[PDB]
């Protein structure tokens, strides 16, 4: 037996799950963040896209067997028979962040037509087939990914293995911009505290930028929410003072904690504010294989079963890569500035002067599309 | 030269003097318009018109309505307005009692204007708009955002007036985008829910107060908040700030407060008498700073606090209580007591606290982190010409003492170094 061809579930459950899908996405994002913060170096800003990782792993699942099926199902924190998730995932796909997920394999490797057609229907793409050799195959990998992401991801994958039976691949970059243009001129050099030393870093300033701010005591943190285009919100968590180390907040962060924080935020209001924040530009390539190992998952390493995808007795992911790009600057969607007739009276002043934990959020489906942290804002 | 009443239906512009370059000198009577966006006494024009609204009631009522709101273009000097009595009362979503646009000029003596709208400030002054006011009793309410609101190079001087804002997120006196405010006799008041009594922020604006009992209440509501380079300079004020999370004086980045000979008493739950952040306060000839609450009264964080001839007091919890890279400097008898042990607490053990004491100062308290720490910390101390520490530290690094320096230690204390002279 191998899993049967998927059934397009009725539109009834198409939105009866989006809640469960969002909660599972949040849980998975927390788990994957913990894994990443493990693998990466201590004072190294990072960014990743639980949305894209989730989508690619769902692709694998749809191509998954039975035991690995269950393992990855638990890893993603999905309910059993969570079929519409596939179609459900499509609903979550937002226009503000552009993603590219793909599967490559050796031309020798055989791909079941059922999976090919089903994936083409749902994910609008099919497993690309590699060339006879590998080196030129890596060249093709890089070129395809680069030209299918508007050239944003220039050199995605380099350390490709000599032998490569199968490969997954994924890369996403944010395209939404500030819903309220920041002034360029206001950008100034200011003090940032990575450690005892205080550095002079560029930061943009807004007189009365509409922020949604409050303090969560449990984590002992200040949370500030900013607006973007395409119905997206940038949540930034900063330690209460200059003493509380960001490691402390990260470790103290728990699923229920984060969920309560996000809900209380979304119910808040965007009171004006004197806002100071450093230019965020985080790029991150990373081998998911280590992360998958550090999430109790091993099928990508051992005894991988992917009947729904192939038939090769020797099945294994040669190298699975991910890349994420985030860049935010004065390039707002529109200059929202007002005139003298205003009485705004900026209420609460907000300025980030220490490494912070930032999650980009949909708020149209309440899942964290992006997640990571910033230490060196330069 | 009108002398009598002028009522009106629900239609705007009870009395307007748009042009014809003349004067009205309305002697008295009453205007009681009630239209929507109607204004009793607009005086400006589309694109010198001195008026004198002697005692008269302008009790308009209507959405967007507003009492006399003379506004004039930038050129040709300005226009002159003069009032008296004139209990101008409005009740509208955005009704202004006095909005004064470019190059305006007004002088008031017994205005006593009231408003009850949604976001309605009492008197807003736009570009130009110099104002001289006596005996004002402006009192606001509702969910608005400010009592007198001065903006963009305006120049206002209040004498013996009182401002009593109410409603959540209401600011007593809000000055920003350049100003030269001067208050003398004012007794600005407030109700809670983030209602700073006096907010000043341009890096070009400057408020100079004199004996004005700025008083707040309710949730976090700085008595005086100096932001983005604002510059307050008090004279015998009373910044009573009895309110949860409040702050006697919050001086923010690039701001500078020249407090001098004025009581600054913060009470209630966690609240600091004076919170200086990356700014420079200077309590010259001051008279007090109390906390009496959970938090300390003199929270420095990258600030150049300079007490002088005044008592910083940790009456409730703690004294200075630095957490950051402070530059404190007491002198001329700054009795920085705490009515408790650990005068200068400091959460961060390595907070670079270049403390000081000179020529008369008394540090009558301890130093201490929030825990027990034997490590190496970035804290200094200096004394001279009579400077006298009188406490135990357990947490200092160097305690260099100059001529007349007197540490007068009291108990167990691990100190990384000393230098007697």
Residue numbers in the entry:
A (entry chain A): 122 to 499
B (entry chain G): 54 to 100, 108 to 481
Provide the authors' own sentences about this structure as they appear in the paper.
The model of the active form of the C1-INH serpin domain was placed and remodeled to fit the volume, with the only major changes in conformation being within the RCL, which is seen to be sequestered within the cleft of the Vag8 beta-barrel fold. The model for the complex reveals that C1-INH associates with the cleft within the Vag8 passenger domain beta-barrel, with two contact sites. The first involves contacts between two loops at the base of the C1-INH serpin domain (around residues 317 and 362) and one of the longer loops incorporated in the Vag8 beta barrel (residues 407 to 410). The other point of contact is a much more significant interaction which buries the side chains of the majority of the RCL residues between 461 and 474 within the Vag8 beta-barrel cleft, burying ∼600 Å2 on both components. Formation of a stable complex involving the RCL sterically occludes C1-INH interactions with its physiological partners.
Complement, contact activation, coagulation, and fibrinolysis are serum protein cascades that need strict regulation to maintain human health. Serum glycoprotein, a C1 inhibitor (C1-INH), is a key regulator (inhibitor) of serine proteases of all the above-mentioned pathways. The mode of inhibition of these proteases involves interaction between the reactive center loop (RCL) of the C-terminal serpin domain of C1-INH to form a covalently linked acyl-enzyme complex that distorts the enzyme active site and is irreversibly bound.
